């Protein structure tokens, strides 16, 4: 039967969506279907913010951040637990945690 009411993707009124490559295994997946996660991680968290601040030549440096949009295919996202198998009723919940 049909598992997901719309589909396992987000494509209504389109027909075709250009694919992206999974960051983990490089599988081709349509962009609307791929699981997309943003990473805003500090350039140095590393249990090392204070060490880099002390070593810094600038007072109040405000070290920058790395921004990375990760695209995961379904299999890789499930395996790496970015996304988990949910119950039939819990699947109908698009709110992030």
């Amino acid at each position: 039967p049909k598992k997901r009411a719309s589909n396992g993707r987000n494509k209504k009124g389109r027909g075709h969506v250009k694919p992206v490559r999974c960051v983990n295994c490089s599988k081709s997946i349509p962009k609307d279907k791929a699981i997309k996660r943003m990473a805003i991680r500090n350039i140095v968290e590393a249990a090392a913010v204070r060490d880099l601040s002390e070593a810094s030549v600038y007072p109040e440096y405000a070290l920058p951040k790395t921004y990375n949009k990760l695209h995961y295919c379904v299999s890789c996202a499930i395996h790496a637990r970015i996304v988990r198998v949910r119950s039939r009723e819990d699947r109908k919940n698009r709110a992030p945690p």
Partner: protein, 212 residues
């Protein structure tokens, strides 16, 4: 059995006549020899230093500046403007979802001879009372804004030399002029001249270089 740092000498990078600070740091090169001139090994080096370090103010922490060595003058490498680029962290922080990213780029010649490509970026923004959550432009606003920015950049270049273009870039007056000329199209929060790329240099003009 070399230890090549015994045959190396240090030189001081004197970047500007205009930035705020002549001293940016030091660079090392092999001592001049018979068939290998240290002045020839230098004079093509590009150093990328932060505009915050060039100006003394952390309000220029983005906008890295490229400085190309033109002459070696008695243990002093006199450089000149070679290009400007935003930092990757600043660019990524500015680029956000639920808004329109507008980019323009022009290839313009400075008043004397310098060919440059200017890349300006801007982002649509919500109004103070806006309830809508994305504030997208209608791509005709985007075309008009791009045309306005292209005209602004092409007239801000072609009316100044490279030195005056750098002195205009430092206070970011071009961003304010773009904001003033586009505020009647779309709010356009994060206006920036994100990059200047040097494409073709004039004849050397050591006299023009000798302003520092």
């Amino acid at each position: 059995v070399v230890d090549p740092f015994t045959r190396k000498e240090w030189f001081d990078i004197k970047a500007p006549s205009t930035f705020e600070n002549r001293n940016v740091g030091k660079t090392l090169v092999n001592k001049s020899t018979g068939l290998k001139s240290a002045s020839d090994a230098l004079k093509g080096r590009v150093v990328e230093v932060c505009l915050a370090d060039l100006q003394g103010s952390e309000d220029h922490s983005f906008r890295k500046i490229k400085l190309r060595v033109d002459e070696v003058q008695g243990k002093n490498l006199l450089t000149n403007f070679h290009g400007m680029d935003f930092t990757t962290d600043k660019l990524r922080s500015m680029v956000r979802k639920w808004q329109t990213l507008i980019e323009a780029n022009v290839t313009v010649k400075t008043s004397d001879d310098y060919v440059l490509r200017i890349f300006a970026i801007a982002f649509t923004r919500k109004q103070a009372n806006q309830v809508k959550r994305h504030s997208y432009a209608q791509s005709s606003h985007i075309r008009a804004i791009r045309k306005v920015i292209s005209e602004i950049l092409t007239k801000e270049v072609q009316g100044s030399t490279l030195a005056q273009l750098t002195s205009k870039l430092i206070p970011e007056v071009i961003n304010k002029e773009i904001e003033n000329a586009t505020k009647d199209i779309f709010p356009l929060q994060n206006i920036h001249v994100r990059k200047v790329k040097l494409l073709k240099q004039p004849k050397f003009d050591v006299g023009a270089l000798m302003a520092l």
